[PDB]
Every structure is written in structure tokens, then in C-alpha cells.
Amino acid sequence: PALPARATAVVAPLPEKNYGSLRGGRWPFLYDNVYGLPVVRQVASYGEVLEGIRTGRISQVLWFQAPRAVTASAAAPPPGLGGPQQPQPPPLASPDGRCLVRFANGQVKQAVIPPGEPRISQALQQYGTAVSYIPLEP
Amino acid sequence: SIPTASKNQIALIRLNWALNKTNINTFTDYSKRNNLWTTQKLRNQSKNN
């Protein structure tokens, strides 16, 4: 069982960027710290995603999710009436509207889209670009 | 899973609902539905008075 890398160095933070949609981009490392996965560095605008959908250059969109606290569920009498406990409410879409967009050429970017927006909703439906939700981490 | 006063209140609520569910609430001495079928007996005993 080979022990993994253990290095250290001094690096200069990257210049902060403001693409309009999101701000930041001061991370000079190709991976993340607590996890071992690559961080994205290219972001999309509103019109960019809209046109990628209209022309078909986007294949599938994925949303993040939220826990949906139990008190806000109407599938049984409320907890406080004393009934047997219900398993769990299904999770909501992203309240803040983060999404990972997947292109026809293997590129994956990040964007912010509010769920239920007027134009994107109609474009998704007309062009059938795949939609899905990213499950929650343990 | 829930405190005591809760379950006491819910027992009282169930008591009230159960008492309502017995379909006896409408019967009163002074209805007309009770005066129309009881005129025969009262007539009989009043003429036999």
C-alpha cells in the first residue's frame, strides 16, 4: 500500500476575476483540499447557456440540491401531533441555483440559473436537452 | 417523542371527536320531527284521559 504524496511549496494566488455571473478565481491549484477532485475554472453566462441550448451544443444540465427540512412537508400530519415518524421529505432543487452544464465536446462548466426561469424552461422543453439533479453528498 | 401535555391534549381532542361521532346530537325534545310521530300517542292518552 503506497503512501500518497506529501509535498509543500509557496504559490502566488491568482488574480480575482468577476465574470459578471460569479466572482473569484483566486485558486492556483488544479484540485481541491478536503476532497481529491478537480475544481472548475470556466463559467457561463445567461445568454451563453441559452444559445448553447438553442443550437444544441449543450447535452445535459445538472442541478445541486438542498435538504428540505421536515416541517415543510405535507405528506402526513405534522411532527408534533405525535404520529409515527415519517421517513424523509424528498430534496429540493438548488435554492441558490448552482448548476453544472455539460457540453457536446466533453467540457463541463459551472453557472447560476434559477430553477423555473421563463426562457430556459421553454428552451429545455422544446429542444429536449437532458436535465438532472446531482444527489447529495453523505 | 413528544412531551406529556401534548398527549394529554390529544387524548382530550380524541374524546371530543368520538363524542361527536355518535350521531345523537340532533335529537331534542322539541323538534317537529319528534312532534309529528308523537301526536298519535298523546291523542290516544288525551282521549283516554
For chain A, say whether B13 makes contact (Cβ under 8 Å). no
The answer to whether A28 touches A14, Cβ cutoff 8 Å, is yes
Interface contact flag, B7 A80, Cβ < 8 Å:
no
Grid cell at residue A60:
445535459
For chain A, say whether B10 makes contact (Cβ under 8 Å). yes
Residue A120's contacts (CB-CB under 8 Å, 6 or more residues apart) are A49, A50, A53, A113
The Cβ-side half-sphere exposure at B41, using a 13 Å CA radius, reads 5
> What is the rounded CA–CA span in Å between residue A23 and residue A68?
28
β-bridge partners, A111: A99
**A67 min Cα distance to partner chain B (Å):** 22
Residue A30's contacts (CB-CB under 8 Å, 6 or more residues apart) are A38, A39
> What is the rounded CA–CA span in Å between residue B45 and residue B38?
11
Interface contact flag, B6 A85, Cβ < 8 Å:
no
Interface contact flag, B2 A85, Cβ < 8 Å:
no
Interface contact flag, B2 A80, Cβ < 8 Å:
yes
Strands A23-24 and A17-18: antiparallel
Give the technique used to solve this structure. Answer: cryo-EM
The answer to whether A48 touches A107, Cβ cutoff 8 Å, is no
